[PDB]
Amino acid sequence: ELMERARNRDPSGVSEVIYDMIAAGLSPGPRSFHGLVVAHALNGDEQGAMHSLRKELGAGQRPLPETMIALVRLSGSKGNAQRGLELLAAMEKLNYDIRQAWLILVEELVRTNHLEEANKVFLKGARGGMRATDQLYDLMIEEDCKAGDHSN
Amino acid sequence: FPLFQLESADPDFYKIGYVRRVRAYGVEFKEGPDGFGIYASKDIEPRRRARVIMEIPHELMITIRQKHPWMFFPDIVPIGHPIFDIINSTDPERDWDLRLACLLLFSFDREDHFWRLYGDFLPAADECSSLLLATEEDLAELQDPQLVSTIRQQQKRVLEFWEKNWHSGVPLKIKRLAEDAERFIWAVSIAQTRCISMKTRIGALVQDLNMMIPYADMLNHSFEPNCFLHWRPKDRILEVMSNAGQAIKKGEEMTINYMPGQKNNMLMERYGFSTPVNPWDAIPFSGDSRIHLNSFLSVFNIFGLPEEYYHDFVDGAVIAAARTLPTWSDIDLPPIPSAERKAVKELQDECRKMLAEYPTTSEQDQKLLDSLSEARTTFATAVKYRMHRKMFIGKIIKALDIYQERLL
Amino acid sequence: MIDRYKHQQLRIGLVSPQQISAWATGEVTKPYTFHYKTNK
Amino acid sequence: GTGFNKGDILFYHREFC
Numbered sequence A: 001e002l003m004e005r006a007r008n009r010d011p012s013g014v015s016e017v018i019y020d021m022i023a024a025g026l027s028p029g030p031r032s033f034h035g036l037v038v039a040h041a042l043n044g045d046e047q048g049a050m051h052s053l054r055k056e057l058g059a060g061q062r063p064l065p066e067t068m069i070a071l072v073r074l075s076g077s078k079g080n081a082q083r084g085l086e087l088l089a090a091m092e093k094l095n096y097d098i099r100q101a102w103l104i105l106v107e108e109l110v111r112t113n114h115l116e117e118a119n120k121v122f123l124k125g126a127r128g129g130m131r132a133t134d135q136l137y138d139l140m141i142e143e144d145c146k147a148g149d150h151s152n
Numbered sequence B: 001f002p003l004f005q006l007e008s009a010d011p012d013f014y015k016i017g018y019v020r021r022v023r024a025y026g027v028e029f030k031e032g033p034d035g036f037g038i039y040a041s042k043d044i045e046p047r048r049r050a051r052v053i054m055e056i057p058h059e060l061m062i063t064i065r066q067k068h069p070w071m072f073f074p075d076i077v078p079i080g081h082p083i084f085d086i087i088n089s090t091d092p093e094r095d096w097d098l099r100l101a102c103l104l105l106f107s108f109d110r111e112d113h114f115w116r117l118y119g120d121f122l123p124a125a126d127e128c129s130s131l132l133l134a135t136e137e138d139l140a141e142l143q144d145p146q147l148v149s150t151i152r153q154q155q156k157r158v159l160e161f162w163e164k165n166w167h168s169g170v171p172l173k174i175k176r177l178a179e180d181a182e183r184f185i186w187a188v189s190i191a192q193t194r195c196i197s198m199k200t201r202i203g204a205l206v207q208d209l210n211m212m213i214p215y216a217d218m219l220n221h222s223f224e225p226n227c228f229l230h231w232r233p234k235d236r237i238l239e240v241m242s243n244a245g246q247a248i249k250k251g252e253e254m255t256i257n258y259m260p261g262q263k264n265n266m267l268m269e270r271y272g273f274s275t276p277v278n279p280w281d282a283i284p285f286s287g288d289s290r291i292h293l294n295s296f297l298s299v300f301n302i303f304g305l306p307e308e309y310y311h312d313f314v315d316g317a318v319i320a321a322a323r324t325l326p327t328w329s330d331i332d333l334p335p336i337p338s339a340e341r342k343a344v345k346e347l348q349d350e351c352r353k354m355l356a357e358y359p360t361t362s363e364q365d366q367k368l369l370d371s372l373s374e375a376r377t378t379f380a381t382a383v384k385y386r387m388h389r390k391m392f393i394g395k396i397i398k399a400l401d402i403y404q405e406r407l408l
Numbered sequence C: 001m002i003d004r005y006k007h008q009q010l011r012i013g014l015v016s017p018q019q020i021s022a023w024a025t026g027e028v029t030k031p032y033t034f035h036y037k038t039n040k
Numbered sequence D: 001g002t003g004f005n006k007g008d009i010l011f012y013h014r015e016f017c
């Protein structure tokens, strides 16, 4: 029922389900909270998604990789490059592979037309030893040269 | 106080290499019922970069150009030899093993060649696991018509080549290379099972070569290997290098990836073996019932892109399942558990139907292997192949069950 | 391999009186070099 | 020669317990 409510973009309903689990004695695991985060992120709500992640950390549960991927994708869609970098650092602290999230964030920043922040994030990742896909390399080169940015 | 408190290989095997500038560091050669292998004689401490394990000089190899024209490095074939005429008539694309077999026979007939001595440590006709030496009875136990047909085609091609080029009128220097057909069949089997292809630079010439490398074919195959081959062009030496930063314990086998991204069927066709943890195996599903790829990866901790799945019960079988199971993805759409349970039930039903299609089971196959006393190597190879397929399907079933368990 | 490009140049050229003034700006008007007595 | 070719989340958010 919680995953249903998350699929119809109803974070409030997911909160009702979580409180129902609390009343029933069922401890809220990472899956239900991940559904809450996804429900908040689907309807472009960054503050609510970060509040749900704060509930994650307060509840003592380890957030799933999909939760962090959704958060970084939302930050890239909104152009919040620094928020995405903070989420990537949190992923690194939690012993997670941040390559996929880095690629997703860079691609989202490019799509939303934030070429400056996309370039900065991509260069941070590349100088950090991370390797991007061939398609991402070609996209970065072509977009930067179309914008007249020869340095990047 | 000091007072109060698999067999080793033939020493001559390494000694003949050692006197010819072959060096092995931190590893020793061991022999078992399955065959030869390379194992760490001590604890290899992980260093900053890759560590040198073995060094094989170029002059001890039998290499031929992978592309037309055929030029051998080092040039052992004299000008005007009929063996060059036999080699030059092969098909450039599919007849690469025939040329290597011809070179192997020619080297075995050469008095000063190194492979005259090293060829005594190659597996014999009754010890080689290649399917070219398998009879019709052994092929019947593969339980795969496609592999059987491929093996029959390969055997027919090899025998046709031998009959065409080793007729009555050939000179004595050619007839003694392979007096009768099964010798050439064994040569082709050895070439297929031990050839290494690489892009090597010699002097200023860069080219691809098909290489019979002594002491490097000794390494066994793995899809998660701890060693890799690097060619050193300045002194023309092939290096066996352990992975950088990867600790190796004493007695751990030295393994390299014979060929990446190849399923068990192609491994059985080429090297005559298969592995149960093949992360590229494919099971043909109907595709009507699908599960969530992201949840499956996250439950079993499988990260990376689809071409680089890796694990932080979970082995290459789980990766192969994730690569072959029908999956759906919608960016960030979560899966509702109810459809997942039905999907995994349908997939488990399909897997059980596939298991029922096989006349026997895997545990009975293992019991038959343990009770086996008068069977050829190819017989056990086919039994192991079918048993490994059965264990792969069973692991798929168990992985689906535990994934549906941990979905809540 | 992309070459590590380095584009450095130097060019001579005939100078203009305005650039001479810009160099000086500052005109030497007397031929005296140093004081005979005070060495200033 | 040698000159050729130019030569914080997860903090302040722990489980209260």
Ligand SMILES: Nc1ncnc2c1ncn2[C@@H]1O[C@H](CSCC[C@H](N)C(=O)O)[C@@H](O)[C@H]1O
Pocket: B034, B035, B036, B037, B121, B122, B123, B128, B129, B130, B193, B194, B217, B218, B219, B220, B221, B222, B271, B272, B273, B275
């Ligand atoms: N992981 C593995 N498990 C079982 N057999 C393997 C294997 N990797 C390689 N082989 C077998 O070893 C052969 C490669 S030559 C490797 C050494 C060989 N076993 C010997 O004693 O001379 C192949 O024919 C293959 O059948």
